[PDB]
Amino acid sequence: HHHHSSGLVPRGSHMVGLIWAQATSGVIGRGGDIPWRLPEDQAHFREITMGHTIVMGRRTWDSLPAKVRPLPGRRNVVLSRQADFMASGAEVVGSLEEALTSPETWVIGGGQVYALALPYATRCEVTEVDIGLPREAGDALAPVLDETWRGETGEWRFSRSGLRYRLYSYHRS
Numbered sequence: 001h002h003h004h005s006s007g008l009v010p011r012g013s014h015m016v017g018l019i020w021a022q023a024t025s026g027v028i029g030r031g032g033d034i035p036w037r038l039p040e041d042q043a044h045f046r047e048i049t050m051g052h053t054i055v056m057g058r059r060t061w062d063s064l065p066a067k068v069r070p071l072p073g074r075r076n077v078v079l080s081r082q083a084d085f086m087a088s089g090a091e092v093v094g095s096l097e098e099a100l101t102s103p104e105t106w107v108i109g110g111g112q113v114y115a116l117a118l119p120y121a122t123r124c125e126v127t128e129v130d131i132g133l134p135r136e137a138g139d140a141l142a143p144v145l146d147e148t149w150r151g152e153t154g155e156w157r158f159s160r161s162g163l164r165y166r167l168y169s170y171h172r173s
């Protein structure tokens, strides 16, 4: 239960990580949008994901502005159960199993997909945003991590955007 894992990824393996930003309450989205824009979090998301495959749910793809998607520098994969859903510039697949063919994959949202992917994941990179944002019916929420996960929490930091935030890194075998 406490064996070490390495950060080096052999090319024959399939490392699955989750990356998300949440308010303390666990909200990650409402009404199809992320309710903040922190430049430190945006930079961090790129630094982690650049050069890898990114997997997202169909609703997260829908929420990206048409002009910015697919996100550059990364293989974009969108999960949909709809046989007629298409994503220009990206691959649409019908299962998580089909999406996880690369050696390093970052699941980048949203609520449903994080839940679905967790069982396969060995890394989570979390940004906590210190914004008063209550959970409302219909909100997209973050996954909750059990005791199989070990992690490190950074100190509270202060965004140029005027909100406090802090970074968590979690891993498991």
Ligand SMILES: NC(=O)c1ccc[n+]([C@@H]2O[C@H](COP(=O)([O-])OP(=O)(O)OC[C@H]3O[C@@H](n4cnc5c(N)ncnc54)[C@H](OP(=O)(O)O)[C@@H]3O)[C@@H](O)[C@H]2O)c1
Pocket: 019, 020, 021, 022, 027, 028, 029, 030, 031, 032, 033, 034, 056, 057, 058, 059, 060, 061, 063, 079, 080, 081, 082, 085, 093, 094, 095, 096, 108, 109, 110, 111, 112, 113, 114, 116, 140
């Ligand atoms: N704060 C953050 O870090 C962050 C990051 C990303 C997104 N978000 C937020 O999350 C919100 C969306 O979350 P969400 O839960 O509503 O939707 P989502 O997870 O982004 O996408 C859900 C869609 O994924 C497809 N899907 C789900 N399970 C599948 C499966 N087993 N196999 C194949 N396809 C599957 C389905 O598409 P079909 O209906 O087409 O079949 C489903 O409707 C966004 O609006 C955004 O606000 C937040």
Ligand SMILES: CCc1nc(N)nc(N)c1OCCCOc1ccccc1CCC(=O)NS(=O)(=O)N(C)C
Pocket: 019, 020, 021, 032, 033, 034, 037, 041, 042, 044, 045, 060, 063, 064, 068, 071, 107, 108, 109, 126, 127
């Ligand atoms: C930057 C937002 C973010 N942060 C973390 N730590 N993890 C994530 N997975 C994450 O989501 C990025 C992908 C989803 O992005 C959106 C989803 C729904 C609505 C809007 C967005 C874009 C928000 C944004 O800040 N975009 S951006 O400028 O950073 N960039 C285009 C990706």
